[PDB]
Amino acid sequence: EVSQDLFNQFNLFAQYSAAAYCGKNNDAPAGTNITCTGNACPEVEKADATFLYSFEDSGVGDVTGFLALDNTNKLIVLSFRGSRSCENWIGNLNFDLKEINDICSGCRGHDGFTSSWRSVADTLRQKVEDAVREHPDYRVVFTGHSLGGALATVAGADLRGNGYDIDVFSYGAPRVGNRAFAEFLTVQTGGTLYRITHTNDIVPRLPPREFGYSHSSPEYWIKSGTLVPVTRNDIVKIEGIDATGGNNQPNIPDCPAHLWYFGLIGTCL
Numbered sequence: 189e190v191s192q193d194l195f196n197q198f199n200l201f202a203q204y205s206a207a208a209y210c211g212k213n214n215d216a217p218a219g220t221n222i223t224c225t226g227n228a229c230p231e232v233e234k235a236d237a238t239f240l241y242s243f244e245d246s247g248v249g250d251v252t253g254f255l256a257l258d259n260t261n262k263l264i265v266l267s268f269r270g271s272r273s274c275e276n277w278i279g280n281l282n283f284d285l286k287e288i289n290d291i292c293s294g295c296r297g298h299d300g301f302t303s304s305w306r307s308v309a310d311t312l313r314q315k316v317e318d319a320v321r322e323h324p325d326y327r328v329v330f331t332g333h334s335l336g337g338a339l340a341t342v343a344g345a346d347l348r349g350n351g352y353d354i355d356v357f358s359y360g361a362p363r364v365g366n367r368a369f370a371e372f373l374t375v376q377t378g379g380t381l382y383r384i385t386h387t388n389d390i391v392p393r394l395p396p397r398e399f400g401y402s403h404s405s406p407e408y409w410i411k412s413g414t415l416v417p418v419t420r421n422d423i424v425k426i427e428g429i430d431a432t433g434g435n436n437q438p439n440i441p442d443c444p445a446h447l448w449y450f451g452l453i454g455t456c457l
């Protein structure tokens with residue numbers, strides 16, 4: 189179980205994550221209102237949420253998403269688009285672990301995710317920082333589904349410690365680095381990581397532990413099924429680095445489970 193307040197936040201940032209897949213939300217003019225095709229992001233649409241910056245195939249890593257200003261909720265939200273792909277990104281991106289000592293000593297991270305973030309980090313840092321200066325009472329939140337949640341995690345770990353908090357909400361994110369990095373993400377000051385998983389979603393089970401990857405603690409495990417509305421009683425907090433009580437169980441994994449985090453995610457055209 190989680191509190192109604194935390195539940196509301198999880199639901200909201202799931203929809204900010206879903207919104208990053210809508211193609212119109214990656215080429216939107218600054219200052220325009222954020223909307224989604226169909227029913228992908230009603231909690232976002234119902235807010236005074238507008239684009240600060242919308243980006244597509246940005247940097248050598250081709251990162252896609254948006255930066256939003258939400259006056260209703262007093263948020264600055266950086267949302268990274270993930271992928272439709274359950275498995276193929278294992279074959280298509282470099283899962284070698286690269287040194288990231290500039291983030292944390294002895295830390296290593298996925299080459300692809302880290303390289304991709306690095307290619308856009310200066311530009312996105314400056315935009316986030318400008319927004320913070322204009323709205324110092326607003327909360328900075330980085331979010332994303334799947335590979336987007338991995339990017340949000342790396343980005344948050346990198347940009348914390350510069351005078352404003354960064355919270356991260358990830359949905360169905362893969363592991364992002366080694367045990368040192370997982371430990372760092374468990375204790376890092378300057379914001380909170382909320383790492384959310386669903387039932388037997390395959391993506392948070394990748395890359396394998398035996399590729400040298402570990403998950404940070406804790407985990408917020410959604411136990412309700414695919415296409416089942418989530419209640420606060422359906423979310424279990426699982427403690428421990430590489431804990432096995434939640435998503436990380438030795439049973440058959442699933443791809444459809446990856447697409448249901450409070451509502452459909454990865455399906456907005």
Ligand SMILES: *[C@@H]1O[C@H](CO)[C@@H](O)[C@H](O)[C@H]1NC(C)=O
Nearest residue numbers: 220221222233234235236237
């Ligand atoms: C954007 O949404 C606000 C309400 O949140 C509304 O006042 C405004 O007219 C909308 N803009 C456009 C161009 O429709």
